[PDB]
Chain length 326, copies 4
């Protein structure tokens, strides 16, 4: 049977409450060993090894953890046939894209979580974890980038996002769709991401202990420019605007970001709107102000790419080209 | 024929570019008179009167404009059979909910926009504006709250949101669905909002010249607490958190907001996730910290209700009850 | 505690396979007693009584079982506080609409099923059944018509349909949305159906032992008229066309159904397209041919309303009026 | 400038009504010359040549028109840089898949239609046709199989389906998503279909003047087996069942099709449910009965693949293999 390493970070898949039917719980309390032992069927499909990396709610995910995960995967690539990462669902879409750009291992890297705690009635985590190991053990899963497996579906790390606060079926690749569906332990793959990922990117975090500082500001009617000003005064390397509509900015925020771009802060226009691209050639003249349009990357994913872009260059033209290729 | 007043505020429905096939344009450049004259079919269904209120891109929408629109509608209620408001699509979902809570006129108030500029090939604005007048003239539309008409569909002001950056079909009521569909100028209504609206709310802005100051902060992996701190130091009356997952907060932001709530700042937990409710009884003990859970209101709509709540009370228990009724 | 009656009819909720991880299974093998004893927490929210009506896969649902169910609910209405019906998911949407038009009981009637068999890892039936009893016990559920509770959502019997062959989240009300969402045993209801239902219809099956015969034919490129002809030659009372697009018919099928409508067969145009209404006033002059347009009813739901209309009248004008009101 | 050939077949894109605001219209009345002259901007992006093949509503599409189209494209492949086919939207999804399996030309083949007639206010056909020519002229479009361009989106011919009866946004690839989105004349392609298409299939219709006869029967509660029986008695080569749920059949229809599969009729199980695969290994033992499971092909698309498979083989094992590869 294939050797599959489970790297555990916490999340509701490792969460517990006092009652099967009350909704209150805490995430990241159950160890990886107890996750594995609770699905004895794993032993028939894989030779499983579990490692606890951290045990937190992914609302508390941070750069230190990202860096650790990428180096761990790249270091151990040759010692296993695939990886499964258990993780909270709240920022899974961020971690998954970060690894999609920095992992240099060609073997399957599959992330998995649960929307209901392990103690819940009809808990979704056991069958998710099962399907994640199936996916990581399948030869067809290699070379597709970092993957997220939830609710019988295989999604790519770039497009996948959380679309509902509570539904087990919340994860969807809302612009370009999923890669495959799983039924009876077999995967019907009909798609693979076209944008460059993993060993095909120039991003290498093997020697880094810190990432550039990138913040996000939200736009809405009568938006305060105070959040944007605070990031600039604190010397942030980049700002991502969660803009309204097609990446548009409220007047005061636009003014602050235009000034910031001229003094060297990288600025990316994204959108609070959940689907579709923030494009060039709409209402904002990006070339005039030195802004970058994020394309289909939502604000939190645009932050991930901008941080990595900032380790290579500070030129907006160059950053735009990166946003057009990854 | 019925008397319908069009109150124009700008938007891409009044926007223009230099080419039918290039995507570049400016919003809010065409006067209301030219909008009306460009759809001569209006004259067969309604006695139309146009008034220009402002002419801006709704990315620049603000409290002054909201206040003006509500008082204008309430003042002129008895002089017309219905209202149509033309407006940019980027913040239409905010304005529509603000009017939904403050308009005291029982006659139909219908908002309408366009995703493609008036100069575009296959411009959607002419047929939208036609259907909006149809909806405002229909007796069945009364008493349903403020309405948004886009792409042959009648949506309620509370649930409606922009779901795509560029698609003509972008507006959807993503939690509870639309009220009606329009075909051949007739409306099949099968739903009406249950939450209290218009003349059934206690919100009255007739004597107000200013609203309480409410800002929004975004959460993501490694989120900065600097945006939250800046709002607090500037003495904001309320903050809305666009949280991850089911309204969760990154550790540093949670710390700052908990401290702020104890010194009197109203705090509401919402979610960057586009559908579903931010609930109580999940991972955050709202009663312990004095926080309010926003339910299905997304961050920008939760700001609208919080501002109005703050003109009546500062008690979190009371504000939670308001979030449970409106 | 409320008294709740569970009427069991079979389905995958009562289905079983030989392995927790293989997909093969048979439906309708587990008795109602075992279903209930498997969810001990029901006894905290209701006094439950189980009755086995039949035990089948709902792909074999038929008129005799529908008539039995309606009569049994109407007869026992005053002996209980609410009903839950366990049922397969394949024709759940048909039965729910049939009961929505023939149940004269004012108490909540809630249907529930499961997409995974009871022996499956992460089986969804136990939490669905728990939620269905919560909904049947909730006073706010009354007077909303017959309801389907699946995946934490409360759906009305008219609009609900199965949208995916295998997903636990397959049930959606795809035209007008759900009525309510359940979280921690509490239901946020924001909608109720406007079309008339249960006690407000004129359909009474108390004295009927059979229903009018109504069959469905499908349209596609180069469609055979043989299926249509076979139903007319057999003397069917009505035929529903699952048309292409907005209820259109392939030419040979058109000719056959136009002739049948003239010699007295009732003909309803519906559509194989999963959302949106089949309307009047498009490419087919229904008035000339005596055809009825089904509005948002899909073919299998149109068949339900046509059968019941045919117990009251055979006039196409009157039938159109029924399709406009229920 | 590229040379692009438009092959016109009719449809609402070529449809006309008496009023810009009434919904009534007839399809297939405007000639190709008038379609092209109505979009003068085409001459800036391509050298266009129009040919009228037929002029019908696509509800009357048939095998003879399919065979004509495939042969005409394969014959003229080397005389042009790309093809656009104008077509009604009702069976667009059928024709596109048929051409996807039989076109041996490597150049882009793009289908396009309109949901509103050309005389309608805000008619969508002109911008769709413009975008379809842009797509056919783009080098990046080649080798992606046959494409459907509607509402600024590029969809593959296998997964695309009509999801709504009247919405301009009705076309979606509901299982695996779209290939690309068009903005300002530029296409962001992120996906290509994995299933084999065009020159990589063994289907060759160059010498055929008819196709095997394959009909479709629908399942629902109390379904009549008469439609199935009529097609068997008439000697049909194959029957596709639009099954309930995951390809299930009402008992009488099951018995009839199991008997037909034994006396040589090819039987494919598909589903009336609009998304998801009909799988093996659920409730029906296909191997015992000689049935084929259609996977994500819906009934009208399964009929297309079954007809073409039947020109190569009659063995159900081989046919299953074809359904697994194309
Ligand atoms: N708050 C949890 C949510 C979950 O895992 O579902 C987390 O992200 O860790
Ligand atoms: N930026 C424009 C977008 C639109 O109207 O579509 C506005 O909101 O005014
Ligand atoms: N064939 C099963 C499917 C299910 O229940 O999910 C049934 O309808 O009875
Ligand atoms: N019946 C018309 C519908 C359309 O084109 O939109 C056709 O398919 O030809």
């Amino acid at each position: 049977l294939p050797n599959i390493t489970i790297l555990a970070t916490g999340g509701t898949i490792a969460g517990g409450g006092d009652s099967a039917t009350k909704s209150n719980y805490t995430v990241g309390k159950v160890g990886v060993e107890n996750l594995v032992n609770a699905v004895p069927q794993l032993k028939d499909i894989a030779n499983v090894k579990g490692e606890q990396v951290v045990n937190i709610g992914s609302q508390d995910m941070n750069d230190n953890v990202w860096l650790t995960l990428a180096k761990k995967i790249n270091t151990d690539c040759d010692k296993t046939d695939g990886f499964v990462i258990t993780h909270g669902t709240d920022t899974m879409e961020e971690t998954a894209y970060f690894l999609d750009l920095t992992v240099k291992c060609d073997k399957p890297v599959v992330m998995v979580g649960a929307m209901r705690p392990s103690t819940s009635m009809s808990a979704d985590g056991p069958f998710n974890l099962y399907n994640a190991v199936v996916t990581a053990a399948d030869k067809a899963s290699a070379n597709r980038g970092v993957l997220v497996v939830m609710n019988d579906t295989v999604l790519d790390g770039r497009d996948v996002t959380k679309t509902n606060t509570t539904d087990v079926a919340t994860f969807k690749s809302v612009n370009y769709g999923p890669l495959g569906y799983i039924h009876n332990g077999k995967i019907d793959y009909q798609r693979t991401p076209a944008r460059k990922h993993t060993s095909d990117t120039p991003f290498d975090v093997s020697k880094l202990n810190e990432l550039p500082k990138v913040g996000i500001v939200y736009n809405y009617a009568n938006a305060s420019d105070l959040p944007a000003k605070a990031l600039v005064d604190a010397g942030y390397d980049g700002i991502v605007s969660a803009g309204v509509g097609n990446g548009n900015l409220y007047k005061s925020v636009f003014d602050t970001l235009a000034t910031a771009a001229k003094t060297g802060t990288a600025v990316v226009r994204s959108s609070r709107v959940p689907t579709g691209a923030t494009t060039q050639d709409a209402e904002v003249d990006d070339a005039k102000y030195g802004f970058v349009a994020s394309g289909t990357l939502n604000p939190q994913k645009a932050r991930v790419l901008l941080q990595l872009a900032l380790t290579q260059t500070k030129d907006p033209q160059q950053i735009q080209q990166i946003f057009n290729q990854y």
